[PDB]
């Protein structure tokens, strides 16, 4: 019947992950368990899986890092680590992933992404970046 | 003492909660937190004022009726009499009577509420 | 045209099979059972969620969100402070002080956005001659602090640095629509 | 081991607890709180992480400011975060909360709840995605996670 | 090149449902009650 | 050992309560198209220890307007009414063996409904009133159904013990023969621990928490976990009662298991009616319960005096 | 220490500060717990000049704008001292709850408030608040105080309701401040 055929599907679920510490790594990090193809992995740790068999929301997705820029994102995780190549697919505006349709090559754009800096230091911090206008006189430095 | 004993361990928990509820946590009081809600802003008057209820009438024919079961309840150990004739007609009488009165309240209007 | 939704054509046909239907629709409360079966049914269906972090909502190219100030392919500054963007900004949000580089151009020396008065509209980057300033992919710029939202030109000019790799492609297929 | 490390998982701990269940208020002023309603919708499911409304300020862990607030609003939102007992957290969301928004120069707004109440995190947009907002509470949760106050006191 | 819009097909869309359907279902009446009192008179013997 | 006892009966019905909340939250979940809780647990095996334990690290509210003795002790009444409900539970063998154990459940749940009626006029405050009144009302409506209902049905089983219902249901079931009996209990157990559509005293669309909007910590939890007992206890009577589950003296624990499995399946029915249908009014809930419950009540009640008689169906005493 | 590291340095001497979050008028009205208020000597032979929070705030703020007040002290002490048996029956007069005074030595009451003390969290009494509570007021005659400073002190019979409100009971609670038959004072 039916019923054997889906737990034969969660068994290899459960036994698609490497063993029981890959497993749990995914399982106690992700709460999903659902197996995928791997498009590609990032120059970071990211894996970006995909499975279209599932609806639109859920033919793709991320399996993040455990540390990006010194951080341990083993628990702490955000959505901010996804690099700009792969935002664009992972969101849906594109079929066609940096692994076959790669970007532009640039001098001025940056090689390591930042992940959202708000409460750490290298923060953002702002200020007037013009300069003084009105300028003073300085008197000199004799009398009479 | 069973039970007076199940009834003290009940109590006791719920104490030893209370208590940690309140000596565990910290506590920052001032005015502004600790009057009455009324949603943002502040109340008009007292709640220690009287709200009219417009059930009253079907509040004591509940106190009536509650009676009726008061009368009605010892009929699992009526039954095991001998007669089973005269309490058959005494319940018959006690239930349809009490129909009655339910009937003479709903036709004359006092299960409505006073708008 | 028109139709009613609540009005009887015409009453009084009742037989005993009628009040039966009717006299077992109560006292059995049979037309909350197919509630209870709709829920039922529901229960049983695939659940439109997802685990957010790791899968997400659709977007597509056309969809504005953080700001950036973006470079030309030789890396020269591609706004030159015609002061416009701000002109039709109607939260007046950006300003601009402009002077020249000592190159002999037309450029800015400053350029911020209270992000905290933008609206997301897109009129600024439907406004500027040279595609300058667009408003980008990242909504995910949430921050501790009120004054982090507030940009100026460096800023912007990170988030260019950052996200040309995705800005490109968005221009790339949303132009021939605008 | 030693006391300070005791203190320290001690702290992790309640941190998880409050982390892991913060009950907002239905308190939305404006049409961010739609999109703070298509976060409790099934897509973006909110009560998936433990964050459930509650309707009365003193049963509520966060106030969520989604909306635009005028001085005629600004003495019932004060009341209310008031009343929410501490521990208790704020997040503005939208460019009206914010700051004063699309409206920041007329006369009856408050041009940010900055002025009346502490925000902890500030969401952006107009309305902020509620994929944003979940962003955001994420975030606050990362922020409940290192508060380190049995430290400090214990370091007092 | 020619132009291209996204303008519908050629022959249309297929027809939409809209009017309300809401299935007529379920027993009789007579069933149920029948039902329900050889229960009851089974329950009492 | 008695001790043990009672903890062996009380610690994992709070487990219970526990987890009701997250299979309430999931279920409704489910039936509204979501996931609930996957998160804080593997999945959300433990958001109702983070729930408990952020309440009682909240600060407690003491208003000004407030009567604080009122206001404390009517938590603390309604826990430990909700858990000795659970002493005279035969499942099959109880913790205390009352001869009058309904009468016990009645008079601890008339006493339940004062923690409410209590707390509401404590707590100095509007919406708290309304709540109180609205539970008067209630309770003004459920109980006289609830009594003679009972009486009726326990008029085949010959006495007010808990534990004789067991052989009386040795080879049936009380829903065959009282269905009807046992459609009205079930409404009225809906009545009974204020569960929608029946909610009437915390309907947040009507009152802001009725009786529960000026507490904030551990008290409002003792409440909560209140509800969520009584839930399981009026499941617990319904399938005592009507569903009787097999006894079998040598083995009981099948008696247990069955009754598992029966209360497991009317709570999730609470479940399922909170996320199917409206809120009642609290005046329609009189009119309904008053105009269609109790005529049907009293005529079934004759019926079930004429019954052990005419057919010669007098049960024993003992 | 500080004058000496230090000079052009300005040092501000407030008597005991009262409001809302304070830690003496909030400190004198939870005695009620306690069935009863002691005080040394009765509360006599003990006199207080208590100054307003915003007095103090104001004037530190002036100090850092004033070309004055480069190198000197500085006495914000408030009007209208007050006794300190008197203050406590102002205060319960206000917080309207009742006021059963008794006498208590020192040595007793410093015992306490040293066990209250044995506290890993911020104590209710001890040795040193006892000894602070139960020690007159300088007289200021020889310094110049707010009003060389741009502050007119605010005196305590117009702001103790803000603070003491918290503690009053319903029945009680709205309730104005002309019913409270204000604080008899002394020169000394
Ligand atoms: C009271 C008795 C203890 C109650 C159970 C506490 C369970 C703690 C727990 O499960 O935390 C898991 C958590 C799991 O990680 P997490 O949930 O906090 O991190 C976020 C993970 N995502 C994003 C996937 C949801 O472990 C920790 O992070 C450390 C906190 C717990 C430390 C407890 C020390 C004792
Ligand atoms: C998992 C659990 C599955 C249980 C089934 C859940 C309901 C599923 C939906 C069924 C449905 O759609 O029915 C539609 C139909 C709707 O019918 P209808 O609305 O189209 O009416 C048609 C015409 N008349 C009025 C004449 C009937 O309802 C039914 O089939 C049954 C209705 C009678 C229900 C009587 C139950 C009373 C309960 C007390 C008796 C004892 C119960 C035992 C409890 C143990
Ligand atoms: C099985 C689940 C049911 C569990 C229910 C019972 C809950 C059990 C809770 C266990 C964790 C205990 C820690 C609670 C600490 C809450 C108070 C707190 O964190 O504030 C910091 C407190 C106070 O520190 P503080 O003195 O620095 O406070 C500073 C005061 N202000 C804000 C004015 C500057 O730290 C402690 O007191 C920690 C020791 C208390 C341990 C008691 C046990
Ligand atoms: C041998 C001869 C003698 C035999 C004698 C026996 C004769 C047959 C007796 C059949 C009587 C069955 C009991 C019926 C009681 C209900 C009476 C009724 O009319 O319905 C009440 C109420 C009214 O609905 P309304 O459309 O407004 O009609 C009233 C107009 N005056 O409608 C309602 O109550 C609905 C509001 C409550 C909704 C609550 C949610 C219910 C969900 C259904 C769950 C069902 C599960 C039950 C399982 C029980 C297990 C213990
Ligand atoms: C914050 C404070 C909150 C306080 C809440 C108090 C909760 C009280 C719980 C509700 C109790 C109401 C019902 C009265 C108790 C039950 C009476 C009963 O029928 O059983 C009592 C039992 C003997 O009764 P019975 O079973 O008929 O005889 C058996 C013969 N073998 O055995 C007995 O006769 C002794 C019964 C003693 C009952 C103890 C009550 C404890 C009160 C402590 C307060
Ligand atoms: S419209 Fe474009 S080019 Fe003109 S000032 Fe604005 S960003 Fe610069
Ligand atoms: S998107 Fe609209 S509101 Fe925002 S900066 Fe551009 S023009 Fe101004
Ligand atoms: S920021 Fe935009 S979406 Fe949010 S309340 Fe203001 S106008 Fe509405």
Sequence with gaps: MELVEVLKRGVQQVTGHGGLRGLLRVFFRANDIRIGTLVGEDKYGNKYYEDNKQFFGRHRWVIYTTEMNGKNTFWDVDGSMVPPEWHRWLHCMTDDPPTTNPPTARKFIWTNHKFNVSATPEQYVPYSTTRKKIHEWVPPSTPY | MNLYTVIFINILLSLTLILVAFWLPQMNLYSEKANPYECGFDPTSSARLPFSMKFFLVAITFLLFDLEIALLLPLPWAIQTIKTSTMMIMAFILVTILSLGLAYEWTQKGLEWTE | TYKYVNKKEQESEVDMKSATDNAARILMWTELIRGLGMTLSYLFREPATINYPFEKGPLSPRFRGEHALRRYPSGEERCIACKLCEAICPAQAITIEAEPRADGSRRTTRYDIDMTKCIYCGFCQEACPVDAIVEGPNFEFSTETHEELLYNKEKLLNNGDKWEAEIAANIQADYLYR | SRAEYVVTKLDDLINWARRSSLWPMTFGLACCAVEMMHMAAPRYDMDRFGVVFRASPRQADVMIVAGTLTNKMAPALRKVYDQMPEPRYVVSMGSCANGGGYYHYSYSVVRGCDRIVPVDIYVPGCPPTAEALLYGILQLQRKIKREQKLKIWYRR | ?45 | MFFINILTLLVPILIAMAFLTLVERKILGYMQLRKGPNIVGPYGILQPFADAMKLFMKEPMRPLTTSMSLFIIAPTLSLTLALSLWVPLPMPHPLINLNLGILFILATSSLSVYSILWSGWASNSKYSLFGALRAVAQTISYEVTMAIILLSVLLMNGSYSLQTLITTQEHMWLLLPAWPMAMMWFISTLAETNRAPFDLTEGESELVSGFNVEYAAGPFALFFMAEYTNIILMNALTTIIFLGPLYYINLPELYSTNFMMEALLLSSTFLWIRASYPRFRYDQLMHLLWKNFLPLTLALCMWHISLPIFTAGVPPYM | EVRSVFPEAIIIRPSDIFGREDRFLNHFANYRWFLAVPLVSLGFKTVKQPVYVADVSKGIVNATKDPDAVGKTFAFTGPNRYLLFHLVKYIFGMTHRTFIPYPLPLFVYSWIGKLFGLSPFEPWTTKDKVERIHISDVMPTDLPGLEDLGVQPTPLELKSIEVLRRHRTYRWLSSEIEETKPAKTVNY
């Design chain 5, 1 to 45: 090149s020619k132009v291209k819009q996204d303008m519908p097909p050629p022959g249309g869309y297929g027809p939409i449902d809209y009017k309300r359907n809401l299935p007529r279902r379920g027993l009789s009446g007579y069933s149920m009650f029948a039902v329900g009192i050889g229960a009851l008179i089974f329950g009492y013997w």
